[PDB]
Design a protein around this ligand. Structure first.
Ligand SMILES: *[C@H](O)[C@H](C[C@@H]1CCNC1=O)NC(=O)[C@H](CC(C)C)NC(=O)OCc1ccccc1
Ligand SMILES: *[C@H](O)[C@H](C[C@@H]1CCNC1=O)NC(=O)[C@H](CC(C)C)NC(=O)OCc1ccccc1
Lengths: 294, 296
């Protein structure tokens, strides 16, 4: 029973607001007396965000926190975000911090529309700095997050979809993940590589679940595995990654470099139709932490 | 993708209940806490416990109920099927609009997995045709709840009790009647053979058509009875005209008649999949319902 699970969303739900500018509406995040939303809410295509921002008043921004309307007492631009100062502090803001998530790591997304939380799901920051999210028109300002004890770590705010169907956005300081810009010009994600650390954790999960048909007695070095991995657009494995896999190595008695020799043969010979935990595809959005926790 | 409902309205209802050295989670709604009755058990979890006997031997004082840091006072108690109802001195201020509902096989819900009264994860899953859940539940998760939220009202449908030897899970509704043939005793128990939820696979095939995946359609069609002959051979639930009517709205938005889709699925079952993918997966997904496909 190994499932993609999201963090409970309640602490974040109390922070979700609707921000409207003229006719374009999206979501904002209300912490203390400040509200964060994508800056492209002030748009009507090569926009000059300094020029459009100077042309706006505090009254132009309609901020609705559920029933009640909040008044912007001031505003400023932080990279690709706006920070709206509001007259009132959210009584429900939790202990929180902003963090910059790293490729391979996961977080939960609270998909919201019109300031109302709609659904919650888990995904991963891919190596090409996009995410395979679920985002419809109106979802901008939806936030991705992790929770550790009582503290919410915010790491993502949604801005855009790319032509490949995947998604791009920023941390909570407004810096984009990846080389993307918030204008609707042609933009392309880089070639997506596979999160090798996560495929390896999934193989440990499978071995723990009772299918070990893919294990072998061949051996590999870290360097000779990385050389093969990159030919197949898998991420090279670091020695920190080997260390992170230690507990699953011990629990199963399969050395990390031996699991790499298994993976190596799967890359080179494919799966002649066989399945691992039920699919002909190696899953790369389950971390070593997820396998350990289940 | 599978999405869970936002868990906030449920998270405020989660508390910790301890009897002796046994701890699990409880659901606190107004002035009463609901929780699995085997919280009053110790070593003889496995021994056929007499729960009427174990309960007559207890006082309100033996139930330690904590809502975070604050301890609530048990004013009374009673058993309802496999649940305990604890009357608490204080009424939960965070109590949402809610009802108790008994879900049917094939229907989906969200699980808030809890430990020591503290929410820790949320996910979507389906009630299996054999009345088990394919959940993710560890020691201490009992009393975790399943629910749907449409729209301001929480529909509680599941409370967790136990894990079968096969790793699937079993529990009750919130009036404490088990789903399936199970009893709350640490004896080894088998579910009936599980099946694939045909109504859900068909709903998902409509979902695939909408987001671009059309490779699997074909010019053929079939009748209800021709299709069920192939489904029974592959361990799929039979399809009925109610199912077809349920799929009606999904026929319109697609322009694909329900029994054309059955022909497409029949080919996918008889032909397998080329190793290619449908909406991302290499297996026929049966835990998204028609009602899920419309919402998302
Ligand atoms: C913000 O609500 C929205 C999120 C997009 C909406 C479609 N799916 C999403 O994730 N962002 C935009 O609409 C974005 C605006 C730029 C100024 C950042 N435009 C965009 O992503 O173009 C791609 C696209 C637009 C509409 C439908 C599908 C793809
Ligand atoms: C309550 O926290 C716990 C959750 C179970 C155990 C770990 N994973 C879970 O889903 N439930 C029990 O421990 C339960 C208590 C009985 C008195 C109902 N016992 C149990 O699940 O034993 C495992 C088992 C049950 C039935 C057949 C075979 C094994």
């Amino acid at each position: 029973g190994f499932r993609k699970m999201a963090f409970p969303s309640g602490k974040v739900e109390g922070c979700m607001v609707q921000v409207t500018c003229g006719t374009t509406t999206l979501n904002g995040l209300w912490l203390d007396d400040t509200v964060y939303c994508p800056r492209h809410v002030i748009c009507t295509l090569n926009p000059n965000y300094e020029d459009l921002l100077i042309r706006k008043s505090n009254h132009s921004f309609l901020v609705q926190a559920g029933n009640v309307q909040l008044r912007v007492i001031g505003h400023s631009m932080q990279n690709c975000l706006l920070r709206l100062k509001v007259d009132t502090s959210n009584p429900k803001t939790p202990k929180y911090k902003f963090v910059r998530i790293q490729p391979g790591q996961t977080f939960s997304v609270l998909a919201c529309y019109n300031g109302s939380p709609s659904g919650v799901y888990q995904c991963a920051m891919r190596p090409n700095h996009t995410i395979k999210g679920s985002f419809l028109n109106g979802s901008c300002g939806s936030v991705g997050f992790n929770i550790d004890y009582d503290c919410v770590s915010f790491c993502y705010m949604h801005h855009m979809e790319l032509p490949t169907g995947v998604h791009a956005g920023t941390d909570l300081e407004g810096k984009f993940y990846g080389p993307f810009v918030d204008r609707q010009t042609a933009q392309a994600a880089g070639t997506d590589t596979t999160i090798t650390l996560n495929v390896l954790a999934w193989l440990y999960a499978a071995v723990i679940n009772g299918d070990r048909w893919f294990l072998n007695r061949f051996t590999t070095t870290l360097n000779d595995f990385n050389l093969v991995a990159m030919k197949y657009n898998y991420e090279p494995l670091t020695q920190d990654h080997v260390d992170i896999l230690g507990p699953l190595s011990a629990q199963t008695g399969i050395a990390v470099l031996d699991m790499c020799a298994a993976l190596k043969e799967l890359l080179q010979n494919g799966m002649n139709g066989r399945t691992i935990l039920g699919s002909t595809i190696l899953e790369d959005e389950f971390t070593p932490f997820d396998v350990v926790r289940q």
